A paper describes a structure:
Staphylococcus aureus FakB1 is a prototypical bacterial FA transfer protein that binds palmitate within a narrow, buried tunnel. Here, we use a combination of X-ray crystallography, NMR spectroscopy, MD simulations, site-directed mutagenesis, and functional biochemical assays to characterize the membrane-bound conformation of FakB. The bacterial class of FA transfer proteins is called FakB, and the bound acyl chains are completely enclosed within the protein interior.
Thus, three independent mutants generated the identical conformational change.
Residue numbers in the entry: 1 to 288
Write the structure that this text describes.
Amino acid sequence: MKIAVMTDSTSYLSQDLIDKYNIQIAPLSVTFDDGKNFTESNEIAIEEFYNKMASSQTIPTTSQPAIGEWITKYEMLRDQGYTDIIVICLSSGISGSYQSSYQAGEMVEGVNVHAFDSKLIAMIEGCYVLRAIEMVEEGYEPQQIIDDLTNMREHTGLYLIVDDLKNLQKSGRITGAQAWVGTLLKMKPVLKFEDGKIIPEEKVRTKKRAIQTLEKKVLDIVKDFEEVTLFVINGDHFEDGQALYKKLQDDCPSAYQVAYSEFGPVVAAHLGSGGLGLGYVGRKIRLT
Ligand SMILES: CCCCCCCCCCCCCCCC(=O)O
């Protein structure tokens, strides 16, 4: 038995872990109305993408990995000699990448494809990849791995702050007067992941109080977990994410694993400039 673990680009794992464990990546894409297409990888400049998103009158569209990259990746893993492939995808409720990976897993002969719906995104999704790899190293069975990941999904979440009301207007989700009143009142919508769906939670004035609410809610949730791993997922606003990270380091005991990360173009295209998330998992994920 030879078990491998792969994922998509929305897991936003650092290139270090991808090189160390040789994790395969099915990249997503983001295309603008001008024809400019960005394929998610650790080589493109996120600053250029943010500058484009600012210099674009219309919001871009996002694209799941085409029903092809999964096929070649499974084929290469089978040619290398792998009996089982555990695939970790972003939330199937927000994207079709999980469905495309599952469908591609049916057209590849010679290896079992275990597609997993992480119901999350970013490093919170990459935590499933890290746990799967760790438990392959421990000598677990793919069914036991899927069971463990499903149990982990029960104690895993992500809260989010949207800062770009102009981006929400550019997508048509809000009106002009709404955006103006939100800017005047410093209104910052707070959202959360629930069963793979992004649902509203609070509407907090100013980004500072919204960050405090993020911390309060996540700490209240993880107080009951035997193991806690927190993740700051920042955007182009370095100061906000760094402040939240340092506040967590000061407020949380060392028994908590606090980490920092940043999301890429596919997430930024829908979150806008200044978005910031706090995610949690109820396990001690091996981040090295
Ligand atoms: C850590 C930040 C989380 C914010 C995530 C916001 C993105 C919502 C949906 C993701 C992109 C849409 C679907 C991906 C590509 C596609 O299938 O079209």
